Design a protein around this nucleic acid. Structure first.
Lengths: 121, 102, 129, 97, 86, 216, 197, 25
RNA sequence: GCGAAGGCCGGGGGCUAGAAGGCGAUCAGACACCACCGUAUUCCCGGCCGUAAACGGUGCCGCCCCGCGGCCGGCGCGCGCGUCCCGCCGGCCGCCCAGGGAAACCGGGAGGCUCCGGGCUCUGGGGGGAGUAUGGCCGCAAGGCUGAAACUUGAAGGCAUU
């Protein structure tokens, strides 16, 4: 019966995308302590602060337990970058695998180059 | 200033528009002017001219607003002017919902 | 069936210009269409027109230069006093300076300007601008 | 305002169609306009079907299916919710919902 | 010569002269927002490199709504030698 | 305060890279800054009049709200006209919205000679026509001796165009003002898109004169 | 000037294949129909279109002005690689309407050219182009709508192999015109970088 | 159907006038 | 000349429904809706009658006009080869870019139109009065067809928005 407001959700999400390392996954109190630092963020009231902290401990569990959408974390961004940059070591893609459509051979003949002397079938 | 400006019979919209400017320049993010009565007519109406965003409810409203009520007198009858000025930067603290997150 | 042939062809020429097609095929051909096309070619609103002669009525293939705004037929082919040809131009054609009303005269099919030049009245075949 | 291109009916290249009767209202409707739903539902309920199959003393018995084409008039069908009023844009949309 | 309205003197008095596009030839309007000018470079001799001698083909928004530009571009390319007629 | 360009065209205009307003109309570019119109027209802006405000109402549970729509014609006296309309609860703000919108939609007008050419285009170059809603107005080229012959609203925008003589004929709900002025606006934007024989010379291919090409 | 290596790669890439539905505008490009119904493209015509697109793409003084838009998940890697290997400004995923027309929009680019993976999928950008005089180049299939597209490339655009190789092939030619590739030697960048796993 | 019922009512008045004329004749 | 239904004149028939009528109920009153019963009618033949929201509410003969499919009736192009493909189609249709419109919407037109003219025939001119009055014609009738005026009056109406 407790649904958070946009302000609570928005503040908490900046807290996680920035100070993810300071936050801990299951404990609200450690996350509340990070909120209490004040240098990281200004939180007016005790209840407002607890709500931002409470969402942030759920967010912390969720970001460790799989990716969470809309969470801009630099360390996770590097992890995809090595995965995206790496291509097969031998660059095995087409690998001269040939294989044509029966109509394609006639189209290749239409150009007149006739790749592989019509041995493409 | 408005009530006495209204007496010289200046345009009622112009009066509010000039007062609205001097509050925003002085810093108020929220400025609200409502003049209500038999203005240029034999019938009642209320004319709200407002520049900016003003909180209207709650504990911040009590300390962050400047509602002032005055009753102009006119041959037609009383055309009371109400001006409410909201300052988030009240220096007494912060807005309860204003999360700086800097 | 087709009572006016020029109008049906000219409408096709305008319709092709709307969809930006240079070449049009006109299914019915006539000497009046022939002459109307020749006058437009002279004023350069249309390009070369080639008639594929057939053992029947004939078809014309016309290359368009994309420079005709509108063509038309006047039905019936009214009688115009040579003096009042200006009134026909003032209303049908835009601007006294630009646009051609195409007439027919005993001397021959002629331009409104040429008709004024010798002051001979006639019957209006149609109009092109 | 022409509400529908169909004009409520699927008569095309026609002038007259067979009359049918709303199955509840018993009213005469043009065949094209009528709802014309079809049901192949079996005779006995799914629960009774297990009890009856165990009871049956003939091997290879299967519950008989019952086939009927329910035709209802517009007023009859919309009231019993066979079809529903649709949004201006959703009226154009067809297909079984 | 000098596209525009030459006065009785012959001075052009047609302020900005609108652009007739390279296929349809209709004048680009003052507010014809969908007019598009696309330029194709010329490979300079041998080298597969530019020469800064790109030729520019304009395309009015009427033939673009039709979608006629891709075909018209191709034909005009061979007309200006940016492709072979094939 | 002063103007800071938010649009690439505005930055070129601020620099002075674009010499004339017509240069942006050659490339038919959108004007998204009224400030750009001031750059080409800085003394007293353009002649703009507010031609009748009609009160407009939306029924609501409490009652009919009232919003004002104003029609403003901005124009000079030579081949430049703009028409726009603006909606605001305050009549004054709506008049401002219309005048700004009119500045955002300035359009060039052709102008030409009825039959005799001297030194000045005195009339519309063609029988320009346009239609907004039911209304349709045709602007017919008129002799230099004749005056501009149109009803007071259409005459007003024809003066801002600077068409010294016209023989306009209007058909439709001309009584509806917004629609009438809009037809006389679409007729003038048609002037610079009607192909005529004098414009049959073939060329273009400017490349470096392109407005997109220019850089700050 | 077709090259044998890319064509053999295209044969594995299936760029020579298109949807059974077919359009008259792309009829010239298509060669035939498989008896399965699938439509088979002319590879040389694709290459001629690819080289033509390169000449158009380079003219823009800043290669940052060409904008690559893809909402197809498969094409995302291709257009981001192309934007990184070349200099295009990427507008991936949801295009966000008014990106090209709203000045107060978080991103308000004024591109001199546009690049589209799918005419139907990336439709918002092609309409946005019309409002602000921007020509467009698209990766069309055998059935596509060429509305508002200045030049179109015949390709699968639904095959990840085909999408990636086409973007790689396009990238090779655009920087070849700028002298940053080899010409007669293989580009060091490989086509498998453009393709997602 | 008011128009259908209105036509029926004119018919009755038309008969009454047509018959009344015969009695007068 | 033909023309749904209802009707009509006169036979044949007569199951079913069922204008009339009668009866339950229902209501304040229903003599209405809902039961139940039931005459004319419904069916056939020989005549009438001549109307329908007889509607695509869109006359007919043309000419051109863009895509995307479906269906039906022929005919070809091929192809391993299948009621497959591809055309030509004659119609029946859906969707639609331009284009058109007051818009809804049409787009196989309601497009090619103030940039207004292929040809032909019909019809309308604010609303009532009035499809009445009167004369004619037609019908056995019911009626149909043609068709006013005095007088009265500021809206009636279309399509859309909240």
């Amino acid at each position: 019966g407790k649904v958070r407001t946009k302000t609570i959700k928005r503040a908490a999400r900046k807290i996680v995308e920035n100070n993810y390392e300071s936050l801990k996954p299951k404990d609200f109190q450690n996350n509340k302590a990070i909120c209490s630092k004040r240098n990281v963020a200004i939180i007016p009231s005790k209840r407002l602060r607890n709500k931002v902290a409470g969402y942030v401990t759920t967010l912390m569990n969720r970001v460790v337990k799989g990716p969470v959408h809309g969470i801009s974390l630099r360390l996770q961004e590097e992890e995809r970058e090595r995965r995206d940059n790496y291509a097969p070591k031998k660059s095995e893609f087409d690998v001269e695998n040939i294989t044509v459509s029966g109509t394609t051979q006639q189209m290749i003949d239409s150009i007149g180059f006739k790749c592989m002397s019509t041995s493409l079938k | 200033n408005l009530r006495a400006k209204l007496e010289e019979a200046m345009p009622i919209r112009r009066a509010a528009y000039s007062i609205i400017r001097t509050a925003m320049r002085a810093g108020a993010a929220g400025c609200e002017v409502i003049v209500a009565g038999k203005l240029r007519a034999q019938r009642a109406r209320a004319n709200k001219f407002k520049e900016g965003c003003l909180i209207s409810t709650g504990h911040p409203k009590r300390i962050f607003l400047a509602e002032a009520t005055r009753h102009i007198k006119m041959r037609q009858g009383v055309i009371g002017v109400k001006v409410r000025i909201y300052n988030p930067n009240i220096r007494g603290a912060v807005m309860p919902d204003k999360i700086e997150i800097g | 069936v087709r009572i006016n042939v020029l109008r049906d062809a000219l409408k096709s020429i305008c319709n092709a210009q709307r969809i930006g097609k240079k070449q049009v095929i006109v299914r019915p051909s006539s000497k009046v269409i022939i002459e109307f096309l020749q006058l437009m070619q002279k004023n350069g609103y249309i390009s070369d027109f080639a008639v594929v002669d057939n053992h029947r009525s004939n078809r014309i293939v016309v290359n368009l230069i994309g420079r005709l705004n509108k063509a038309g037929v006047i039905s019936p082919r009214f009688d115009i006093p040579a003096n009042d040809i200006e009134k026909w131009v003032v209303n049908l054609l835009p601007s006294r300076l630009f646009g051609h009303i195409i007439l027919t005269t005993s001397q021959g099919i002629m331009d409104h300007i040429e008709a004024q030049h010798r002051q001979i009245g006639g019957k209006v075949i149609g109009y092109f601008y | 305002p022409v509400k529908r291109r169909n004009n409520g009916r699927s008569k095309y290249n026609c002038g007259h169609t067979n009359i049918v009767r709303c199955q509840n209202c018993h009213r005469c409707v043009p065949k094209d306009k009528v709802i014309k739903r079809f049901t192949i539902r079996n005779i006995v309920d799914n629960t009774i079907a297990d009890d009856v199959l165990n009871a049956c003393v003939i091997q290879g018995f299967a519950i008989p299916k019952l086939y009927n084409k329910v035709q209802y008039c517009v007023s009859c069908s919309i009231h019993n919710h066979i079809v529903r009023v649709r949004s201006r844009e959703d009226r154009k949309i067809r297909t079984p919902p | 010569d000098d596209i525009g309205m030459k006065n009785s003197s012959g001075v052009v008095v047609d302020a900005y002269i609108p652009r007739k596009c390279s296929a349809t030839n209709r004048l680009i309007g003052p507010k014809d927002h969908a007019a598009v000018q696309l330029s194709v470079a010329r490979v300079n001799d041998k080298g597969k490199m530019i020469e800064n001698n790109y030729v520019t083909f304009a395309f009015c928004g009427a033939i673009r709504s039709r979608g006629g530009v891709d075909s018209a571009f191709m034909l005009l390319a061979q007309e200006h030698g940016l492709m072979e007629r094939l | 305060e002063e103007w800071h360009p938010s649009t690439k065209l505005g930055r070129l205009v601020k620099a002075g890279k674009i010499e004339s307003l017509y240069d942006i109309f050659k490339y038919s570019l959108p004007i998204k800054e009224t400030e750009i119109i001031d750059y080409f027209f800085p003394k007293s802006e353009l002649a703009e009049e507010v031609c009748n405000i009609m009160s407009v109402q939306k029924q609501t549970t409490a009652g009919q709200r009232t919003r004002f729509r104003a029609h403003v014609i901005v124009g000079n006296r030579d081949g430049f006209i703009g028409y726009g309309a603006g909606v605001s609860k305050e009549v004054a703000n709506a008049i401002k919205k219309a005048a700004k919108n009119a500045r955002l939609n300035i359009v060039p007008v052709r102008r030409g000679f009825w039959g005799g050419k001297l030194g000045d285009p005195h009339t519309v170059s063609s029988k320009l026509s346009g239609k907004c809603g039911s209304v349709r107005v045709r602007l017919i080229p008129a002799p230099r001796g004749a005056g501009i012959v149109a009803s007071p609203t259409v005459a007003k925008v024809l003066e801002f165009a600077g068409v010294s003589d016209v023989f306009t004929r209007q058909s439709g709900h001309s009584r509806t003002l917004m629609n009438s002025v809009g037809a006389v606006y679409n007729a003038l934007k048609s002037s610079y898109s009607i192909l005529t024989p004098d414009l049959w010379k073939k060329e273009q291919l400017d490349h470096v004169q392109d407005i997109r090409t220019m850089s700050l | 000037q077709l090259k044998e290596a890319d064509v053999k790669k295209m044969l594995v890439a299936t760029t020579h294949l298109g949807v059974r539905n077919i359009d008259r505008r792309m009829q010239f490009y298509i060669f035939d129909r498989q008896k399965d119904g699938t439509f088979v493209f002319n590879l040389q015509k694709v290459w001629a279109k690819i080289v033509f697109a390169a000449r158009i793409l380079v003219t823009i003084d800043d290669p940052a002005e060409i904008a690559v838009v893809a909402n197809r998940p498969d094409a995302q890697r291709a257009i981001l690689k192309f934007c990184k290997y070349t200099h295009a400004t990427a507008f991936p995923g949801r295009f966000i309407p008014g990106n090209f027309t709203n000045r107060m929009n978080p991103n308000y680019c004024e591109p001199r050219l546009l690049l589209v993976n799918d005419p139907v999928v990336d439709r918002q950008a092609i309409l946005e182009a019309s409002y602000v005089n921007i020509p467009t180049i698209s990766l069309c299939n055998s059935d596509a709508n060429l509305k508002f597209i200045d030049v179109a490339i015949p390709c699968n655009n639904k095959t990840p192999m085909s999408i990636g190789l086409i973007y790689w092939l396009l990238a090779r030619e655009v920087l070849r015109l700028k002298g940053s590739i080899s010409r007669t030697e293989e580009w060091d960048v490989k086509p498998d970088l453009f393709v997602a796993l | 159907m008011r128009a259908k019922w209105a036509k029926k009512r004119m018919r009755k008045l038309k008969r009454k006038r047509r018959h009344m004329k015969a009695r007068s004749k």
